[PDB]
Amino acid sequence: EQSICQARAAVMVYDDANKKWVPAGGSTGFSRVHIYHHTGNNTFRVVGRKIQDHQVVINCAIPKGLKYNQATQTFHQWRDARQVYGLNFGSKEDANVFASAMMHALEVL
Amino acid sequence: TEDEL
Ligand SMILES: *C(=O)[C@@H]1CC[C@@H]2C=C[C@H]3CCN(C(=O)[C@@H]4CC[C@H]5C=C[C@]6(CCCN6C(=O)[C@H](Cc6ccccc6Cl)NC(C)=O)C(=O)N54)[C@@H]3C(=O)N21
């Protein structure tokens, strides 16, 4: 696996039942969020770990055809069959870096 | 929201 980006974000998931975002992994705070490329089958994943205690709070596949919603310049989100994910980026620069790499992934899948 | 963050 090769990291194609690193971006600072608080990783959220949406709790539909209570219509609230909650911190991924139950752990408030920022993570270092990568997109990793597995070249052997040209697959990509989003993997994020808490800056402080290194807990993996997101590890999801990026499917071909994903709709990546840039809701704001610092909060981007997407959904799959099971969950909705949000990234509250530490800065616009982080959001741009991540969105660049995500859009690249989605274009070569 | 700040309440969620
Ligand atoms: C507080 O600030 C929380 C946590 C940080 C984050 C940051 C910025 C806000 C930008 C608006 N917002 C929302 O969550 C919006 C507010 C309206 C609310 C309603 C539905 C939400 C949440 C569930 C998913 N969703 C959507 O709107 C999706 C968006 C989407 C479109 C297309 C492809 C994928 C997706 Cl995920 N629409 C649907 C029908 O699922 C949402 O985002 N909301 C942020 C925060 O409040 N917020």
Count of Cβ atoms closer than 10 Å to residue A102 Cβ: 23
Asked whether the beta carbons of residue B5 and residue A22 sit closer than 8 angstroms, the reply is: no
Q: Which residues line ligand 1 (CB under 6 A)?
A: A 12, 14, 21, 67, 69, 71-72, 75, 77-79, 84, 86, 88; B 1, 4-5
Resolution in Å equals 1.0
Give the up-direction half-sphere exposure of residue A12: CA atoms within 13 A in the CB hemisphere: 22
Method used to solve the structure? X-ray
In the 8-state DSSP scheme, what is residue A92? H
| Number of helical H runs and strand E runs in chain A | 1, 7
d(CA A2, CA A19): 35
Q: Is the CB of residue A59 less than 8 Å from the CB of residue A50?
A: no
Residues of B with CB under 8 A from a CB of A: 1, 4-5
Q: Which residue has the tokens 């690249």?
A: A104
Phi, psi of A74 (to 5 degrees): -125, 5
Ordered structural domains, chain A, with CATH: 1-109 (2.30.29.30)
Terminal CA-CA length for chain A: 16
Q: Is the CB of residue A1 less than 8 Å from the CB of residue A37?
A: yes
Å between B4 CA and nearest CA of chain A? 6
d(CA A34, CA A32): 7
Phi, psi of A83 (to 5 degrees): -145, 160
d(CA A92, CA B4): 20
| Residue-level length of chain B | 5
